[PDB]
Design a protein around this ligand. Sequence first.
Ligand code: MET
Ligand code: MET
Ligand code: MET
Ligand code: MET
Ligand SMILES: [Mn+2]
Ligand SMILES: [Mn+2]
Ligand SMILES: [Mn+2]
Ligand SMILES: [Mn+2]
Ligand SMILES: [Mn+2]
Ligand SMILES: [Mn+2]
Ligand SMILES: [Mn+2]
Ligand SMILES: [Mn+2]
Ligand SMILES: [Mn+2]
Ligand SMILES: [Mn+2]
Ligand SMILES: [Mn+2]
Ligand SMILES: [Mn+2]
Ligand SMILES: [Mn+2]
Lengths: 266, 261, 259, 259
Amino acid sequence: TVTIKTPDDIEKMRIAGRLAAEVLEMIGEHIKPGVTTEELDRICHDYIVNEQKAIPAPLNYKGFPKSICTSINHVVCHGIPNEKPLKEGDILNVDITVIKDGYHGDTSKMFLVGKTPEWADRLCQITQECMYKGISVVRPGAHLGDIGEIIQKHAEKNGFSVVREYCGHGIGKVFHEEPQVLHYGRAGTGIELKEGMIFTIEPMINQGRPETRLLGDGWTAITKDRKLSAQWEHTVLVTADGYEILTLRNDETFPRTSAAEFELVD
Amino acid sequence: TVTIKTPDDIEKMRIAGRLAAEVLEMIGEHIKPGVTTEELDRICHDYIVNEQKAIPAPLNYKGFPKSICTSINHVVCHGIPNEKPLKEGDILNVDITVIKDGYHGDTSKMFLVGKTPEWADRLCQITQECMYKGISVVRPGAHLGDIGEIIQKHAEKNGFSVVREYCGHGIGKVFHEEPQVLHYGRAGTGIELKEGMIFTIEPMINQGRPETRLLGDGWTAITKDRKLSAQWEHTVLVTADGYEILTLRNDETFPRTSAAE
Amino acid sequence: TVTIKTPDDIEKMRIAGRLAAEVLEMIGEHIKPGVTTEELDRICHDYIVNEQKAIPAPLNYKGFPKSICTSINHVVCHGIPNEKPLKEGDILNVDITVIKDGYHGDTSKMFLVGKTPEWADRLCQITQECMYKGISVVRPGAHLGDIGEIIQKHAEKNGFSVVREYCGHGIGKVFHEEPQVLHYGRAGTGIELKEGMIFTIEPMINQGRPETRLLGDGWTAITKDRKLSAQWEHTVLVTADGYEILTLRNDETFPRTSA
Amino acid sequence: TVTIKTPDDIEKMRIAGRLAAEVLEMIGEHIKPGVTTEELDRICHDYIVNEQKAIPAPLNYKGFPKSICTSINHVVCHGIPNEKPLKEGDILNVDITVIKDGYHGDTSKMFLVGKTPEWADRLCQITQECMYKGISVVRPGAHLGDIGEIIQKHAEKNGFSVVREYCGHGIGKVFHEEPQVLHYGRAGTGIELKEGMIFTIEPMINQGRPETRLLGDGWTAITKDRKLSAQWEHTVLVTADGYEILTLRNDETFPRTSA
Ligand code: MET
Ligand code: MET
Ligand code: MET
Ligand code: MET
Ligand SMILES: [Mn+2]
Ligand SMILES: [Mn+2]
Ligand SMILES: [Mn+2]
Ligand SMILES: [Mn+2]
Ligand SMILES: [Mn+2]
Ligand SMILES: [Mn+2]
Ligand SMILES: [Mn+2]
Ligand SMILES: [Mn+2]
Ligand SMILES: [Mn+2]
Ligand SMILES: [Mn+2]
Ligand SMILES: [Mn+2]
Ligand SMILES: [Mn+2]
Ligand SMILES: [Mn+2]
């Protein structure tokens, strides 16, 4: 069963969600050619632990040895931070998860490292759109398939493919719980959404074919065809009216809630 | 019945050979006019070390300063990656060796950079044909000379010459071991091939005359006459009844084994 | 290190070999269109256990769920007896191994079910010849490679191909022991044969390409091109000056031994 | 380069071989104490010319003055038939070659005349075994060395030595062609055999040391140490996967072919 969070859980989830967003607003300043993913990891780790008084959820999670995941270029997800420097032209996903007093906030974004090819930029833009469209359909009475279909149609119209081997997930006082949030599928299928459900929408969208391959560290997934892949992620609450993005950043213009979306249509 | 078993060493050589082949498959998509050979070298080195969790065997080998060899046009072999960009019309050999947990896989292939002249295309095709002919005679009871004869005949019939001062070699847990695999000679001579032997066939074929000379850096060999030179290389295992190419790529149509098409 | 059977081991292997042969001699009378391979399996099972006072070696061996293997048409080896009826035109391998007081006799033969097409008959014939040829070169001083070369030359010369990833095997008080016996290769290579070695020669020979594919049950191997495949097997003793076929049937005219 | 025979050549070589063998079958009844080798020569000459409509190949061949060779006792080979009678206790090699319509068949055999010295019969039997073992390794892919090695090991195990100064040879529409077939040497070296080659295996095996001495007649070779020497010879075809003995006699029990 999918857990239904109480009003109290939801307030604590807003808090965790705001912190994870703040790690991303903070780290952007440090991202330039030459900085290593491990130095970014150390910066996020110290911010989360020393300033936010919280804990990086990935750390030691099923063996994962670092505090954040850093996925660059043809890396699809779960890249382990290391001493390899960022190179101008890279696209970088920084994926944060913060646990504040037992509650998880999970979110990621793409960064452009110095000057980047314009078509890498567009992959990143289109992928964020896919995420935003997936969020736009969330409301009580929608079905999980609604989210997959709308992401999949937008990616595919743009000549990209959706990664099927990884999905979004319920999130709460546990990092990964039901449901599996697939980023492909058919409208009206899968479980029905209810107020108080909380889950991530985190589409991985590849420039070429959808298949991935795992490296020998057990975590780093790359595109089998070595083409680019981008991801963005938010933690989403189902509200009485529709959705609330718990991990919204201050640099984002997408409406935080169905209520803010209704207002702007006036 | 029982499913066939292979010695451990042989499966670890098949892994090393498949990795070496994948580096060539990978690097093809990066080769175009304007890319420097030192840039190819960095791309290959990072893919071997960071993704394959393996080691570029050429690196610091007898002092060689790079991770791959890049040999262009009248360069015969062992060209040192550098800051010179590839130009339209270049022929380029990229020669990889990977060491995966101590086992080596050694292979090279010719790339046509942009629109190349027909005579450079013909040199590359016939050199590849020479290599595949050499591989085709490999089986228990073949003699090393069979490989040199078949290559020499195909090269010379088509107007080309064989470089004599470089040869293929045994390979396994060491990068270079006995035997010397000459790309010229006479059938039925030299040692008899035995099942489990692994060695390379890597003919260097010249547009003009066979003589080469070594430059100042002690690695870069060039044709004496300054005409083109092409090379292709595979790592080959002698099997119970024929050959198995350990470094075969997905883009190759030649059969991986004798059986076996 | 290949085990060398002692004279007593040899008497015991002869008994097991004769029993495995008599299972094929027996089951032949039951094979016709309409009979299911799970019926054949039950009949062989009851014969080995209740009559011979022996054990069907394949039963529960690495999980194999039946007492014999029944490979039809494009199936290469290890087919699992089941509810499908034999059809007119099928070729069928019944592969038997009996354990009689701890000693194994392993043998298989092809059956032509009703009227069979000429190309199926030819394949079965040439595979039998291949197996007999492989048997004929066995003597002390020969090498395992002599068996693979003679089989593969006879197959290929007649347009057929040799399955490469499955082989014959030493046999004794254990079902599968050293050496691997490839049905392809070069004469004079591999281990040297000595009196008292016992092993199988069980070539699988394909109508089209050599390659095979394992199905979902983890056992049933089929030709990759779905063309026909045939197998014949015998358990073979290296004697002082040639061979002895421990699993010879009385329907066979090839000599029991080289002398 | 060794010549390769066509199928028509081979049918003709079969005829020449069979005729050569038939001379040895015919001559047996005339071998007894008191018969001279020149009488055996004349009888074989007349049989070949008058009855087989063929020609004795040794006649006038490089000066040789007779139709057959007859080598007795310590004579190793190429004895010239003459007026000396066979004596109780002799061992005698009769070496025949017939040309039939241009094709040659070359074969010899030992005869024991009456009561022979006691280790003379075994010399002759071991020499025939040596020849048979040489034949038994012939197939495409074998090496000439394989013949040399198997013969030499059997001879030396029995305390005998192999004559090195003479050898077997290619044969066909010519009496002596490539390659030299040495009766000593090392497995897996020398010329590799191919289907359609035809050559002789004709080991000369000495009771004592291997060295020979040539007599004044330029032909008759004897053992330097004067101990007994024996020889047997057949013409051998390399077939698709083994051998065919073109000069087999009806008195022999070794198989005509590997098949
Ligand atoms: C090493 S655990 C990383 C998990 C990732 N934050 C996710 O979105 O599930
Ligand atoms: C299910 S075990 C199959 C064994 C088969 N009789 C063989 O030859 O090895
Ligand atoms: C600089 S060492 C390069 C050696 C090369 N890969 C070979 O085939 O031997
Ligand atoms: C005097 S010619 C005799 C030749 C002999 N028959 C041989 O085998 O060569
Ligand atoms: Mn990526
Ligand atoms: Mn995440
Ligand atoms: Mn997530
Ligand atoms: Mn078996
Ligand atoms: Mn060149
Ligand atoms: Mn090499
Ligand atoms: Mn190389
Ligand atoms: Mn069996
Ligand atoms: Mn079959
Ligand atoms: Mn004599
Ligand atoms: Mn002769
Ligand atoms: Mn003769
Ligand atoms: Mn040889």
